[model samples]
Target chain A: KVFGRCELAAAMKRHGLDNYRGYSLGNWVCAAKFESNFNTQATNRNTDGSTDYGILQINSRWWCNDGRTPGSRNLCNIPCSALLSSDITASVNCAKKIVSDGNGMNAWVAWRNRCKGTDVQAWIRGCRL
Target chain B: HHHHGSDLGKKLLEAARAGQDDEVRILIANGADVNANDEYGSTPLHLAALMGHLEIVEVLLKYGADVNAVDHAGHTPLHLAAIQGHLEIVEVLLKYGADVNAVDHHGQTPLHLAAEMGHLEIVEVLLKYGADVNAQDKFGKTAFDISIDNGNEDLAEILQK
Candidate 1:
């Protein structure tokens, strides 16, 4: 499912992604926008023998068990399949774990590359939530 | 407007953040502030340090960029470098007089960041460069304490000294 900016912001807020780990809700929304264009099933395979899955593009290398990544640990302890589903719950929980690992939002390359140092608040602007 | 907030300065920041070594030089030669900060209080050096742009770091420093420029949150380039595990950049900043023991608003030093991020090599470098092993954060937790809290036995052992 594709989400509009306001819809994603509302969903993220419902999941308590706002201000998670001292990061703004807009930051999370912006990261999702870049990672997947707000698609619920976006995925990207890495040249480094890993794959990113779902809206936030959670990685198989560290976060999810794809059963194909080399030396998969599935640290998030969830199947990569769970992330590609329309359900945002598993994806949000995994993302929370990744940020909690001391890297904060810096864990997402898309976030650092496209979301940082910008007016990220625009991601949530006009959203009722 | 401050020169740092000027268009030219913004260009310099983009160059440094994107690793455009030549563009950074040109912008600085054209009068951009080597230490200019954007709306976030992050300077070119801070961006270069965080992004692992060694060449930009060098250029900014040669132009007298503040080795210890702190952002609004008290994070220095060293703190950014350590958090990102840019070992060579960290080394260079130290040689250029980056404060090894500098702390951010949370009272977390570069060593503390390195430890929490599990950057063993950065932690070793910070320690060798006179980082205070006993330094604590707002919670009064030392780097060693942080390593333990993060379940990083590897860094815990190293920070214990």
Candidate 2:
């Protein structure tokens, strides 16, 4: 699990997501904060009975395969559990692809709700780039 | 989850849910049970339908997966696909001879759930398939009633007519 915003930004930059898909680094950091609070092991079930996995909280309904739901589209072509690793490589990679959609960062409800506007750089303030 | 069959059967569930079409085909070719039920009584067909994997749904059906199979909730694959807003999967299941008017334990047809979830496309497809428009649930709530309660005016109007 990431302990600070700097660590997350550095990892995401290395994954080629720093403005990689028309979304800024701040957008990603803000989303990660609301999604899983940088907690790699976080998983939450949605009201629709779908579950989200890993730091980005990618939903199992269309993105990853959680054993609980059968025949998951797994559009990201990655296992849901793999997104929960401390490594953060697979999670960042999957998230990069997700942002390529027309919705971009809005793919995450957390981003739309908590981080869409309003001082996104504050998420990385203490971490010093 | 837990399948009541061989290790391959369990693996089949994993592969199917994971959208591993080639692995599923390989397992089925090696004698995997396509109709094996998991602990939730969900068959591979059920999972395929719920996940909106058209290819997997076709694969399961080609191997003779029960089109009308139900889970513990008495929800058939059609019911699942409808609630999830998978229009194509619903169409495929209907083509395979799924019962449009089949009721679950609560006597709720696919139309009732689709309307409740505000899936207008699925509701239209069910109606096109000759679903009983006036069908009631255990509480005598029709699909129109569900659409109205959920404030889905467009769907309510469609069902109303």
> TM-score: which candidate is best?
1
Docking class of 1: incorrect
lDDT of 1 by residue, A9-47 (tens): 888999998898888899998788657756788878887
Q: Estimate each model's TM-score.
A: 0.59, 0.55
- The digit string of per-residue lDDT tens for model 1 on B1-161 reads 46444778889888888889989988988888677777668899998997789989988999899999997658899988886678999999999999999977658799977776578899888988899998877757788876664466787678766
Candidate with top DockQ is 1
Q: What is candidate 2's lDDT per residue for B118-141, written digit by digit as tens?
A: 678889899999989889876678
Of the candidates shown, which would achieve the greatest lDDT relative to the real structure? 1
List runs of model 2 lying over 4 Å from the truth: A1-129, B1-5
lDDT of 2 at A85: 90
Clashing residue pairs found in predicted model 2: A71-B17
lDDT of each: 0.82, 0.77
